[PDB]
Design a protein around this ligand. Structure first.
Ligand SMILES: Nc1ncnc2c1ncn2[C@@H]1O[C@H](COP(=O)(O)OP(=O)(O)NP(=O)(O)O)[C@@H](O)[C@H]1O
Ligand SMILES: [Mg+2]
Lengths: 601, 129
């Protein structure tokens, strides 16, 4: 009340909070959240925080000063993720209609009347922009992009035309059409209020010059009233309001929190266990989304049983099934992950494409996409205008590769450009140079083997492998438990079906929360004898020197002709490669070949 | 893999001469494999310094060897994105810059580190074909 004279917006907030039909505050538990909203949002209101506490129906006034005792102690509070006054704006708006609305138009009319009175009934772009920003300031936001071009974002609400599944989220608009419709529809009511106010004053008894002044004002306002609908005037008003709606540091703070997923029925939160769905008002800056509705995991659903049976069919090994599901569970999380990546091959009709594609299109194009094999096949790095395919992983958490023409040797150098959870820079199509954040669960499956071509620690630790065990053929001959019939309905349909995708998403989130509760969070804790044994068998293979030791080494010599024997060991039987390893390769010289123990030239 | 020096633009990079641009940066290279140098002239060998790391991190520390220690996954998986750790490291770096500024004048070819010269001379004894 000391600062009551200043900031009529304080009066506006007071009248807004006066329309709380039930006892909203109760006590500070379950309601301190709103208190924090006021505290953090109402910064300048350090004394008005205590003043509102005094006004709180269950507080110091009712002897409940201990309720705020845990609330004014953190006066500065060093605020974390912030609640906004728009949250306060939301209730007493969608909880107690009228009254609140009436004071809202009262404030609008006050501002517009002040502007009209000050400048003798002449209206320009900036005045309308101020009124509009004070009139719809909680639904639109403007921020300059990387290319130096401003963009418009609008919060979506139920009951209005929209694309499918973009509810409770922020949409990008090249032009705020709804803003034009609004300024051409709702603002005319305020202008009519101004006109009737002028008429009411005109009807009152006054001196002759007062009536002449009011007649001149009415004529000027009538002249200026039709300007609110002209195209150029509206465009200029939008251009002026552009500056008012600008909010610094918005685009770079969009879709940054990896614990929130944009789904078709709101936003999915995985901060706690169990994961909760926010299908109501919020304030998180979420723009990217997938069109998959989220439902709690339930095995009783027929599609869930069908999918579980399908996973059993594809992966006979229970431990391999569990490990694969746990690894795929990390696709939803868009944060930093352990440096793991696997491959798995097999014969035709194995079922790779079904599972990989289903995961890819259930995570959505925004969070997952298919990437070309040449992105890592090509060892040559791009200098200017890097790969736009290399830019497909921006924000994406999943990517799969199915393209191999016979055996292929990978770079083993650009792997750490994609496996290390660190940073890497890439320049987009004709816009600017930027940097990445390596957060993506990548997979690669196709026929034929992969040539690692190297024997080093690291890349070997940061890699896994698997092989198929079931084949589908139209001849399901008996005595072959690994041979099963085909279900072309699985690939041609059953994927475009939304219900199957929803069931798979439920299974995936259940597996993610299972990996969350047990094994802590790390993935290098689950025990899988099959996968580890297969990976160490792949370790034994592709290591030519080890096979040479195993079968050629029995029970001058200082690499003078040992290098020639090595270049004949594998570079003759198999075409030929440049074997530059020599005494320079002291690890090879001191490998198991050193069992001769001949350290003498 | 092991890499061979090519004595191309090694002189250009080190040289402080002024498209064209200056090089007001500190350049360093490291690898797990020995480098190969073909040139012999004193022009390149008048500069450059070699060193060999001794301690190696192994989660299974073999006895009778102080070069085993252990792998700290928390040093890489985290402790890097921490603002506080970066602030402390920056403070240490500026403190060491001040240390180099107050003593030994400012030039770096004034502090005596006999280990580094001995190791560089030993390395130059190697690669002498
Ligand atoms: N559990 C299952 N039971 C029966 N049929 C299935 C099952 N899963 C997939 N199929 C079918 O098996 C066929 C194999 O599909 P697909 O994934 O394209 O084979 P693929 O091995 O992954 N690709 P490719 O290796 O090049 O032949 C499709 O017709 C699927 O509908
Ligand atoms: Mg397939």
């Amino acid at each position: 009340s000391i600062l009551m004279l200043h900031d009529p917006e304080a009066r506006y907030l007071h009248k807004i909070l006066n329309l709380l039909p039930p006892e909203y505050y109760v006590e500070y538990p379950l309601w301190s959240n709103v208190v924090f909203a006021l505290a953090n949002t109402s910064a300048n209101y350090r004394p008005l925080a205590e003043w509102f506490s005094q006004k709180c129906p269950e507080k110091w006034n009712t002897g409940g000063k201990e309720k705020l005792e845990k609330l004014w102690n953190d006066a500065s509070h060093h605020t974390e993720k912030k609640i906004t006054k728009r949250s306060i704006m939301y209730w007493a708006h969608k909880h107690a209609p009228q009254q609140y609305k009436e004071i809202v138009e009262q404030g609008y009319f006050s501002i517009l009347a002040e502007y009209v009175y000050s400048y003798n009934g002449m209206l320009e772009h900036y005045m309308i922009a101020k009124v509009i920003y004070a009139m719809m300031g909680n639904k639109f936001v403007v921020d300059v992009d990387s290319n130096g071009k401003y963009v418009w974002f609008e919060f979506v609400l139920p009951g209005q035309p929209m694309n499918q599944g973009e509810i409770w989220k922020w949409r990008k608009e090249v032009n705020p059409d709804e803003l034009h419709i609004y300024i051409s529809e709702n603002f005319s009511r305020v202008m009519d209020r101004i006109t009737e106010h002028i008429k009411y004053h005109l009807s009152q008894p006054h001196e002759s010059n007062i009536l002449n002044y009011y007649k001149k004002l009415l004529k000027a306002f009538e002249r200026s009233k039709s300007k609110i609908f002209n195209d150029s005037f509206k465009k200029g008003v939008i251009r002026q309001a552009e500056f008012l709606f600008r909010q610094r540091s918005f685009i770079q703070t969009l879709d940054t929190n990896p614990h929130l997923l944009g789904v078709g029925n709101g936003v999915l939160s995985i901060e706690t266990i169990p994961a909760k769905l926010i299908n109501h008002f919020h304030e998180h800056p979420i723009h990217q989304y997938t069109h998959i509705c989220y439902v709690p995991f339930n095995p009783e659903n027929p599609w869930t049983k069908l999918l579980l049976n399908a996973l059993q069919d594809i992966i006979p090994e229970l431990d391999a099934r569990l490990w694969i599901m746990f690894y795929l569970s990390t696709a939803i999380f868009r944060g930093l992950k352990e440096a793991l990546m696997l491959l798995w091959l097999g014969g035709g009709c194995n079922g790779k494409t079904f599972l990989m594609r289903l995961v890819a299109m259930v995570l959505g194009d925004h969070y997952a996409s298919k990437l070309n094999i040449s992105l890592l096949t090509s060892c040559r790095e791009t200098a200017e205008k890097p790969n736009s395919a290399f830019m497909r992983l921006k924000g994406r958490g999943y990517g799969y590769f199915e393209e191999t023409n016979k055996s292929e040797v990978l770079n083993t150098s650009r792997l750490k450009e994609m496996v290390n959870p660190g940073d890497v820079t890439a320049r987009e199509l004709n816009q600017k140079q930027e940097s990445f954040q390596m957060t993506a669960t990548m997979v690669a499956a196709s026929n034929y083997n992969f040539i690692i071509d190297t024997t080093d620690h690291g890349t070997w630790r940061r890699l896994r492998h698997y092989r198929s065990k079931v084949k589908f053929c139209h001849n399901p001959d008996p005595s072959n438990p690994y041979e099963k019939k085909e279900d072309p309905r699985f690939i041609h349909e059953y994927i475009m079906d939304p219900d199957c995708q929803n069931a798979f998403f439920s299974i995936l989130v259940y597996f993610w929360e299972k990996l969350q509760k047990e094994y802590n969070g790390q993935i290098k804790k689950v025990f899988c004898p099959t996968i580890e044994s297969e990976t160490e068998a792949y370790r034994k293979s592709q290591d030519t020197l080890h096979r040479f030791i195993t079968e050629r080494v029995v029970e001058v010599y200082n690499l003078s002709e040992v290098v020639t024997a090595y270049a004949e060991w594998y570079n003759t039987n198999i075409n030929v490669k440049r074997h530059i390893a020599l005494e320079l390769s002291q690890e090879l010289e001191n490998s198991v070949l050193e069992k001769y123990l001949q350290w003498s030239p």
